[PDB]
RNA sequence: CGCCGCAGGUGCAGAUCUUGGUGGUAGUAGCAAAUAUUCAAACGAGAACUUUGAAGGCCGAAGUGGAGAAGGGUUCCAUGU
């Protein structure tokens, strides 16, 4: 439906490529906003205070390679908003990265 | 959707019990009245037996809060109302034939129930009252009963303040200027939905529009002056007070959270009296009133020669009828006018009975 | 209640003191009542107040 | 400076009272012909010739 | 007031105005020439579309300077902006004229832009501070704008 | 806490305090306001009572 | 809606620096209700101020 | 204002002329000295800049800390726009 969520890992070293040391970790929190307005269907990405945390675990140069989240698909149906659908991200801690697919995560 | 309406049997007594206790109070203060006596002590004794009859009411149940509306509020021949001397105060001695205009107000568990009365003072026997005194308070008597047919669903509160205007100028007389009454509901005195008499520019283009509802309390009141109908301040100490729950300021004086403290908890929301303290009740009152934690109820003096008058009473609207649960002993026989009513409409209404 | 400069040059200068005693107390009371808010009325005062001690003072000068 | 003397306090003591707004009331006189203080002063764009 | 270029017919016409506002007038002297003649619905929308740089205006007398883009090829033309400020203000002035016709009572949905003029209001002055200790000019170019929608189909 | 004449010293604002408000004073720390008017803070003696002088004075 | 003086008056009567004193980030209306101290102090004494500890600086390395 | 006389501080394109206003330049130069910001929330019509919290940083006690002297003069403090 449009409540559902799932779980990614983004590879922030290869979206994170090329840009200058005092940008880095900027950069990568609005390339994981670009990676879930992108799988998922809506503008208004909110993320989580957690998720900034990991992205940020290493200083401002040295993001992490990869990052494991769970992008939720929540009803906006709080507010009279212009926007009834928005996307929660959350950070998952993981250990190691290898043979993670995209899973559907129940409720 | 919590709101006491008076839907209910229980609330319909003690409801017939409130104009009842005021009634019996408005009646043992007017044998009581009389010529050369102290003014502050018929307040004293005005509170007196209301705090025991009060008390000795319901003896089975004990838990719910009930006392004072508002305050025993007393003007004589020069002031409009809202006035309640202190100790401190120089007391006013009732003379001979004056006219005095007394206010009250009970509270039983924040449903409201407001008397207030105009006389005169000392009349004999077999005596004609006449002058422009005998005009303003018998006008004011036809606005009540007026006010008593007129009170229904339907009828608009600008129809209310035409008709007393109409009257007004049939009696030579005018309103005293900008007064509102109140549409009641448990544990309030300021609603919302209120009546206007005698209003100008600013009063007009600022007051509601609104239609009489079905189930609700009305305390009607009517000021009418024999004069200009114009009020202002002689520098007289502004004595009745009462809080506004809505804002909310930190107070920093010790005696004003000490005065705050004990304002809440006895005259939570309804207008009080610095008679009920007063050496920390005055410096108190300052620091409060200041950041407008109170509103405050000033004294309204008219011009010297002038006379005002007054009537208020609550009543109850059900769909069948209103019922005027207080009322004050005015009889015409023993009080003339030298004019009379001329227009056709208050005719009507005079006759037309409820 | 107003005082002329015409009436007072027949007292003697044991209640035309007095008079500006009690003139200068009802001016004290008058700039509290300014300070503390007041009324307009109190305020007006003050002026007719100081003009009665100017007149007071005068003859007696 | 904190360290001032009497008569340099009474000076900025004035300067402070007249760097006042014209009363509003002062527009309704007749024949007004002022709109502004003129002669108001600001701490930091022009300073006091003491 | 005198409005110029008065309508044709002031009962299916419907007018708003604003002076000394604080936009640049050469960005909303473009603005209010490619708004010209526009339909009101597709006027609107495409102000909104300025704003979010999906749409722009083409520079055409007042483009010193000013860069190419690609959407400058819809409007036969070579340089265009998005002017932010430009497009809130025309579209709070759209809404204050969409107002105005249902207010004589005169339908929206058919209104077209008729006429739309944008005047030099009086600068503001303020001061910049150049090398060898002087004083620079550092002047604003408000606008008064005006517009009149035609109910036309 | 009075306004009084920067031309008078504490003994003399003791002395007017005490006179023509009929109470006994401790003592007078005086300070001059920005404004330029002398402020005076009049410490009442521990058998007298501000808030009640406040009251007669008419500043309560 | 905004906490400046709030923060100054809490640093204060904390007798610490600005950096060490943590208001409620949820209960912002309470605290911005307390316009003087006595209502700090009841903030702090009730936990919605509270004195951040010292950021460790370990002398174990050295040692 | 015409006509008869009278009297001039009597005719402007210039003087790097005086004063005032306005253009092209031009939506241009520019808003690049001292490493750095990010996430969520609150108020709010409106938030890159306000406030709170979380994180990453900097000053690094010869400080971007805490106080004064000259100098300033109300800039101090609350509340509101
Ligand atoms: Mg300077
Ligand atoms: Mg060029
Ligand atoms: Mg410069
Ligand atoms: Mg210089
Ligand atoms: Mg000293
Ligand atoms: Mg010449
Ligand atoms: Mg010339
Ligand atoms: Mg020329
Ligand atoms: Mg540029
Ligand atoms: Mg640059
Ligand atoms: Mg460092
Ligand atoms: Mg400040």
Same mark, same amino acid.
């Given at each position: 439906?449009?409540?559902?969520?799932?779980?990614?890992?983004?590879?922030?070293?290869?979206?994170?490529?090329?840009?200058?040391?005092?940008?880095?970790?900027?950069?990568?929190?609005?390339?994981?906003?670009?990676?879930?307005?992108?799988?998922?269907?809506?503008?208004?990405?909110?993320?989580?205070?957690?998720?900034?945390?990991?992205?940020?675990?290493?200083?401002?140069?040295?993001?992490?390679?990869?990052?494991?989240?769970?992008?939720?698909?929540?009803?906006?149906?709080?507010?009279?908003?212009?926007?009834?659908?928005?996307?929660?991200?959350?950070?998952?801690?993981?250990?190691?990265?290898?043979?993670?697919?995209?899973?559907?995560?129940?409720? | 959707?919590?709101?006491?309406?008076?839907?209910?049997?229980?609330?319909?007594?003690?409801?017939?019990?409130?104009?009842?206790?005021?009634?019996?109070?408005?009646?043992?203060?007017?044998?009581?009245?009389?010529?050369?006596?102290?003014?502050?002590?018929?307040?004293?004794?005005?509170?007196?037996?209301?705090?025991?009859?009060?008390?000795?009411?319901?003896?089975?149940?004990?838990?719910?809060?009930?006392?004072?509306?508002?305050?025993?509020?007393?003007?004589?021949?020069?002031?409009?109302?809202?006035?309640?001397?202190?100790?401190?105060?120089?007391?006013?001695?009732?003379?001979?034939?004056?006219?005095?205009?007394?206010?009250?107000?009970?509270?039983?568990?924040?449903?409201?129930?407001?008397?207030?009365?105009?006389?005169?003072?000392?009349?004999?026997?077999?005596?004609?009252?006449?002058?422009?005194?005998?005009?303003?308070?018998?006008?004011?008597?036809?606005?009540?009963?007026?006010?008593?047919?007129?009170?229904?669903?339907?009828?608009?509160?600008?129809?209310?303040?035409?008709?007393?205007?109409?009257?007004?100028?049939?009696?030579?007389?005018?309103?005293?200027?900008?007064?509102?009454?109140?549409?009641?509901?448990?544990?309030?005195?300021?609603?919302?939905?209120?009546?206007?008499?005698?209003?100008?520019?600013?009063?007009?283009?600022?007051?509601?529009?609104?239609?009489?509802?079905?189930?609700?309390?009305?305390?009607?009141?009517?000021?009418?002056?024999?004069?200009?109908?114009?009020?202002?301040?002689?520098?007289?100490?502004?004595?009745?007070?009462?809080?506004?729950?809505?804002?909310?300021?930190?107070?920093?004086?010790?005696?004003?959270?000490?005065?705050?403290?004990?304002?809440?908890?006895?005259?939570?929301?309804?207008?009080?009296?610095?008679?009920?303290?007063?050496?920390?009740?005055?410096?108190?009152?300052?620091?409060?009133?200041?950041?407008?934690?109170?509103?405050?109820?000033?004294?309204?003096?008219?011009?010297?020669?002038?006379?005002?008058?007054?009537?208020?009473?609550?009543?109850?609207?059900?769909?069948?009828?209103?019922?005027?649960?207080?009322?004050?002993?005015?009889?015409?026989?023993?009080?003339?006018?030298?004019?009379?009513?001329?227009?056709?409409?208050?005719?009507?209404?005079?006759?037309?009975?409820? | 209640?107003?005082?002329?400069?015409?009436?007072?040059? /027949?007292?003697?200068?044991?209640? %035309?003191? =007095?008079?500006?005693?009690?003139? #200068?107390?009802?001016?004290?009371? !008058?700039? &509290?009542?300014?300070?503390? /808010?007041?009324?307009?009325?109190? %305020?007006? =005062?003050?002026?007719?107040?100081? #003009?009665?001690?100017?007149?007071? !003072?005068? &003859?007696?000068? | 400076?904190?360290?001032?003397?009497?008569?340099?306090?009474?000076?900025?003591?004035?300067?402070?009272?007249?760097?006042?707004?014209?009363?509003?009331?002062?527009?309704?006189?007749?024949?007004?012909?002022?709109?502004?203080?003129?002669?108001?002063?600001?701490?930091?764009?022009?300073?006091?010739?003491? | 007031?005198?409005?110029?270029?008065?309508?044709?017919?002031?009962?299916?016409?419907?007018?708003?105005?604003?002076?000394?506002?604080?936009?640049?007038?050469?960005?909303?002297?473009?603005?209010?020439?490619?708004?010209?003649?526009?339909?009101?619905?597709?006027?609107?929308?495409?102000?909104?579309?300025?704003?979010?740089?999906?749409?722009?205006?083409?520079?055409?007398?007042?483009?010193?300077?000013?860069?190419?883009?690609?959407?400058?090829?819809?409007?036969?033309?070579?340089?265009?902006?998005?002017?932010?400020?430009?497009?809130?203000?025309?579209?709070?002035?759209?809404?204050?004229?969409?107002?105005?016709?249902?207010?004589?009572?005169?339908?929206?949905?058919?209104?077209?832009?008729?006429?739309?003029?944008?005047?030099?209001?009086?600068?503001?002055?303020?001061?910049?501070?150049?090398?060898?200790?002087?004083?620079?000019?550092?002047?604003?170019?408000?606008?008064?704008?005006?517009?009149?929608?035609?109910?036309?189909? | 806490?009075?306004?009084?004449?920067?031309?008078?010293?504490?003994?003399?604002?003791?002395?007017?305090?005490?006179?023509?408000?009929?109470?006994?004073?401790?003592?007078?720390?005086?300070?001059?306001?920005?404004?330029?008017?002398?402020?005076?803070?009049?410490?009442?003696?521990?058998?007298?009572?501000?808030?009640?002088?406040?009251?007669?004075?008419?500043?309560? | 809606?905004?906490?400046?003086?709030?923060?100054?008056?809490?640093?204060?009567?904390?007798?610490?620096?600005?950096?060490?004193?943590?208001?409620?980030?949820?209960?912002?209306?309470?605290?911005?209700?307390?316009?003087?101290?006595?209502?700090?102090?009841?903030?702090?004494?009730?936990?919605?101020?509270?004195?951040?500890?010292?950021?460790?600086?370990?002398?174990?390395?050295?040692?």
């Amino acid at each position: 439906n449009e409540v559902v969520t799932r779980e990614y890992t983004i590879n922030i070293h290869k979206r994170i490529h090329g840009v200058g040391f005092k940008k880095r970790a900027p950069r990568a929190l609005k390339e994981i906003r670009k990676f879930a307005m992108k799988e998922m269907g809506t503008p208004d990405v909110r993320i989580d205070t957690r998720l900034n945390k990991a992205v940020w675990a290493k200083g401002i140069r040295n993001v992490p390679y990869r990052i494991r989240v769970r992008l939720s698909r929540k009803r906006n149906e709080d507010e009279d908003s212009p926007n009834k659908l928005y996307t929660l991200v959350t950070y998952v801690p993981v250990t190691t990265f290898k043979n993670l697919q995209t899973v559907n995560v129940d409720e | 959707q919590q709101e006491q309406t008076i839907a209910e049997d229980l609330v319909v007594t003690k409801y017939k019990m409130g104009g009842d206790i005021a009634n019996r109070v408005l009646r043992s203060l007017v044998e009581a009245s009389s010529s050369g006596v102290s003014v502050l002590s018929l307040c004293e004794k005005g509170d007196a037996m209301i705090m025991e009859e009060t008390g000795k009411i319901f003896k089975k149940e004990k838990e719910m809060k009930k006392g004072i509306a508002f305050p025993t509020s007393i003007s004589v021949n020069n002031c409009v109302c809202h006035f309640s001397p202190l100790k401190s105060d120089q007391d006013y001695i009732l003379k001979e034939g004056d006219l005095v205009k007394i206010d009250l107000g009970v509270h039983v568990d924040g449903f409201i129930a407001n008397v207030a009365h105009t006389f005169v003072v000392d009349v004999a026997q077999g005596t004609q009252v006449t002058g422009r005194k005998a005009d303003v308070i018998k006008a004011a008597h036809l606005c009540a009963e007026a006010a008593l047919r007129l009170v229904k669903p339907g009828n608009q509160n600008t129809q209310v303040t035409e008709a007393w205007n109409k009257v007004a100028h049939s009696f030579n007389c005018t309103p005293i200027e900008g007064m509102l009454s109140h549409q009641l509901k448990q544990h309030v005195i300021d609603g919302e939905k209120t009546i206007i008499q005698n209003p100008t520019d600013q009063q007009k283009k600022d007051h509601e529009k609104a239609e009489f509802e079905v189930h609700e309390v009305y305390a009607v009141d009517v000021l009418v002056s024999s004069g200009e109908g114009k009020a202002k301040d002689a520098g007289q100490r502004t004595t009745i007070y009462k809080r506004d729950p809505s804002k909310q300021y930190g107070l920093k004086m010790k005696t004003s959270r000490a005065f705050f403290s004990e304002v809440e908890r006895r005259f939570d929301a309804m207008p009080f009296t610095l008679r009920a303290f007063e050496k920390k009740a005055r410096m108190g009152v300052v620091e409060c009133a200041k950041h407008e934690l109170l509103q405050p109820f000033n004294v309204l003096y008219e011009k010297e020669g002038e006379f005002v008058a007054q009537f208020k009473f609550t009543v109850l609207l059900m769909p069948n009828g209103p019922m005027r649960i207080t009322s004050g002993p005015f009889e015409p026989d023993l009080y003339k006018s030298e004019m009379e009513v001329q227009d056709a409409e208050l005719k009507a209404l005079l006759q037309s009975s409820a | 209640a107003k005082i002329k400069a015409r009436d007072l040059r /027949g007292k003697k200068k044991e209640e %035309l003191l =007095k008079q500006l005693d009690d003139l #200068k107390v009802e001016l004290s009371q !008058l700039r &509290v009542a300014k300070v503390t /808010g007041g009324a307009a009325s109190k %305020l007006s =005062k003050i002026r007719v107040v100081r #003009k009665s001690i100017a007149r007071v !003072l005068t &003859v007696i000068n | 400076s904190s360290h001032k003397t009497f008569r340099i306090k009474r000076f900025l003591a004035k300067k402070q009272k007249q760097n006042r707004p014209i009363p509003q009331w002062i527009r309704m006189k007749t024949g007004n012909k002022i709109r502004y203080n003129s002669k108001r002063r600001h701490w930091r764009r022009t300073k006091l010739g003491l | 007031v005198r409005y110029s270029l008065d309508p044709e017919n002031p009962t299916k016409s419907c007018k708003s105005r604003g002076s000394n506002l604080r936009v640049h007038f050469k960005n909303t002297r473009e603005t209010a020439q490619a708004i010209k003649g526009m339909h009101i619905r597709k006027a609107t929308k495409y102000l909104k579309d300025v704003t979010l740089q999906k749409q722009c205006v083409p520079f055409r007398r007042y483009n010193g300077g000013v860069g190419r883009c690609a959407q400058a090829k819809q409007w036969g033309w070579t340089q265009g902006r998005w002017p932010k400020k430009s497009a809130e203000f025309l579209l709070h002035m759209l809404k204050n004229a969409e107002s105005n016709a249902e207010l004589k009572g005169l339908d929206v949905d058919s209104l077209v832009i008729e006429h739309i003029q944008v005047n030099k209001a009086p600068k503001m002055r303020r001061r910049t501070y150049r090398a060898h200790g002087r004083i620079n000019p550092y002047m604003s170019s408000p606008c008064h704008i005006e517009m009149i929608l035609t109910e036309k189909e | 806490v009075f306004i009084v004449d920067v031309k008078a010293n504490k003994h003399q604002i003791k002395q007017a305090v005490k006179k023509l408000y009929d109470i006994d004073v401790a003592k007078v720390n005086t300070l001059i306001r920005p404004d330029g008017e002398k402020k005076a803070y009049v410490r009442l003696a521990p058998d007298y009572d501000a808030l009640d002088v406040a009251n007669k004075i008419g500043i309560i | 809606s905004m906490l400046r003086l709030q923060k100054r008056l809490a640093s204060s009567v904390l007798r610490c620096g600005k950096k060490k004193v943590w208001l409620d980030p949820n209960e912002t209306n309470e605290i911005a209700n307390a316009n003087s101290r006595q209502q700090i102090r009841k903030l702090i004494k009730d936990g919605l101020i509270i004195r951040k500890p010292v950021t460790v600086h370990s002398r174990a390395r050295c040692r």
